[PDB]
Amino acid sequence: ASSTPQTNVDSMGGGHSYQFNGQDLTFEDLRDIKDVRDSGGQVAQLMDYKALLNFGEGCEIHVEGDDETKQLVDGEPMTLSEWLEDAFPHLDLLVLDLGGDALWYPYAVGEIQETITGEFKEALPAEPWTLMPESDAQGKVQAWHQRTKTHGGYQTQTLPADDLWHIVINKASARDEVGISEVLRNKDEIQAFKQNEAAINQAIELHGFPQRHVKVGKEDGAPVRDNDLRRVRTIFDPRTTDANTAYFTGQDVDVETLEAHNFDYSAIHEMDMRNLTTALGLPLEAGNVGADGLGSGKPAELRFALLKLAIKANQRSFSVQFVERVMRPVVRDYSPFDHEADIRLEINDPLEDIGEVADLIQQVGDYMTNEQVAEKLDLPAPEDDEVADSYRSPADMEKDEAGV
């Protein structure tokens, strides 16, 4: 075969010029994503729920054959997992920030940082709306172009791709190194939602409340002028009126009502929410809306299967890129360990029923090692390797050892 790709990629063109495509977006489009994110309301809350489902449950670092890595780091032994957990103390927060950004924006992006001594400090995120990638003829990122607010306008620079890192969740193809914003992808549905919310709010003000219409004069009678109506407005002024006011009139005064003109804003709101939630891939229930026949049985099981599959796909896509483009470089450059080790970062499932896992262990624990049980149950494995490796319970062995 060959040592470089020989199929072309669509991902080359006249830069951030006046053409339109998902990888060709401008700094204005990036700030448009930022404006949707900033401005709050229902749309922001749904996309935050999406970030929390994908990344909010926290994380765990594994190394295949971790114990074999055991080495003196600073006069004391560590394994590579112990070193990584010390290199990234607050990884649960970092994963939520980057995982959030990579759902909103086309990419999460950032820097490695060192101490003055040159020991590793942190992986430091960068504000994704400020940065855009520049790519070669085969679609790989060569440089990062940044512009940012500064005294009296914008300040601009270029950075080499060799010392930033970036992560992409949403892609046009497996070949796409630049990715897609789900905000810009679904911008029509977001605009439609916001327009109908404004339309409902305005319609409630005009039509949701009754209004008094006093008509003055006889039909085909003497005309009443504006100054004449002023003296009538004074008698019926709603600011001066109170609940049990009574009225006395001649025959030629009529106190009519503009009724509240019924319209089903609830059904319109439900329709907007159903459009938006499905556009963002969330279940309808995330929008505080429900439907008949979807609450239980196989209809419930399927929508929750689809949600958990969507989460697993995002989680793996993020996990692989974070290990390959943040953790391995950090191990290679700042660590006594082998960077070619089988590191995994796994992100917790947000929708695990611990009570179901416990009942599973009651049924088939007789076929699981104590370490496999501890893993499913989300606890540390036993301190004794034979206890960890054995199948029958640690308490069931402990009560038998107590028989000696």
Partner 1 sequence: EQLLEVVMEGRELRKVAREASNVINANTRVGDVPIASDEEFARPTGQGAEIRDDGETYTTVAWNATKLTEGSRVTDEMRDQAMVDLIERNIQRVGASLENGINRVFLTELVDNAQNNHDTAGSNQGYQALNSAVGEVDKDDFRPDTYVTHPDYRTQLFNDTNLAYANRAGTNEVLRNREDAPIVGDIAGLDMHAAMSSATYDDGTDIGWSGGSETWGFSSDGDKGAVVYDRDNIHTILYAPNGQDVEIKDYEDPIRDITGVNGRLHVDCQYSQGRSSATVQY
Residues found near partner 1 in the complex (CB under 8 A): 18, 20, 28, 31, 151-154
By C-beta, is 153 or 223 nearer to partner 1? 153
Least Å distance between CB 151 and partner 1? 4
| The residue type at 150 | T
Measured from the CB atom, the residue of 32 and 136 that comes closer to partner 1 is: 32
DSSP percent split of the chain into helix, strand, coil, nearest 5:
45, 15, 40
The owner of tokens 């499932």 is: 349
In the complex, the smallest distance separating the C-beta of residue 302 from partner 1, rounded to whole angstroms, is 35
Of 29 and 101, CB closest to partner 1: 29
Rounded to 5°, angle at Cα 163 from 92 and 320: 45
User: Strands 77-78 and 71-72: what pairing?
Assistant: antiparallel
208-213 own/partner pairs: CB under 8 Å, 24+ apart: 208/260, 209/260, 210/257, 210/258, 210/259, 210/260, 211/257, 211/258, 212/236, 212/238, 212/255, 212/256, 212/257, 212/258, 213/255, 213/256, 213/257, 213/258
- Closest contact distance (angstroms) between CB of 82 and partner 1 is 47
Beta carbon nearer to partner 1, 29 or 177: 29
Encode 112-146: b = buried (16+ Cβ within 10 Å), e = exposed: beeeeeeebebbeebebbbbbbebeeebebeebbb
CB of 137 to partner 1, least distance (A): 24
Please say which residue, 151 or 230, places its beta carbon nearer to partner 1.
151
Report the nearest approach of partner 1 to the CB of residue 168 (Å).
Answer: 24
Asked whether the beta carbons of 307 and 351 are under 8 A apart, the reply is yes
Looking at beta carbons only, is 18 or 248 nearer to partner 1? Answer: 18
Of the two residues 18 and 367, which places its CB atom closer to partner 1 in the complex? 18
Shortest reach from residue 271's CB to partner 1, in Å: 23
Tell me the DSSP string of 111-176: EEEE-TTSSEEEEEEE-GGGEEEEE-TTS-EEEEEEEEEETTEEEEEEEETTSEEEE-SS-SSTT-
Q: Closest approach of Cβ 134 to partner 1, in Å? A: 20
Nearest to 138 by CA among 324, 10, 20, 22: 10
Q: Which of 154/304 has CB closer to partner 1?
A: 154
Among 376, 344, 381, CA closest to 363: 376
CB of 20 to partner 1, least distance (A): 8
In Å, how far are 25, 228, 239 from 249, measured between CA atoms? 69, 15, 20
Nearest-approach distance from CB 158 to partner 1, in angstroms:
16
Residue 35 beta carbon to partner 1: minimum distance, rounded to whole angstroms = 9
Q: How many CB atoms lie within 10 A of CB 59?
A: 19
Question: By C-beta, is 45 or 155 nearer to partner 1?
Answer: 155
Rank residues 20 and 367 by Cβ distance to partner 1 and give the closer one.
20
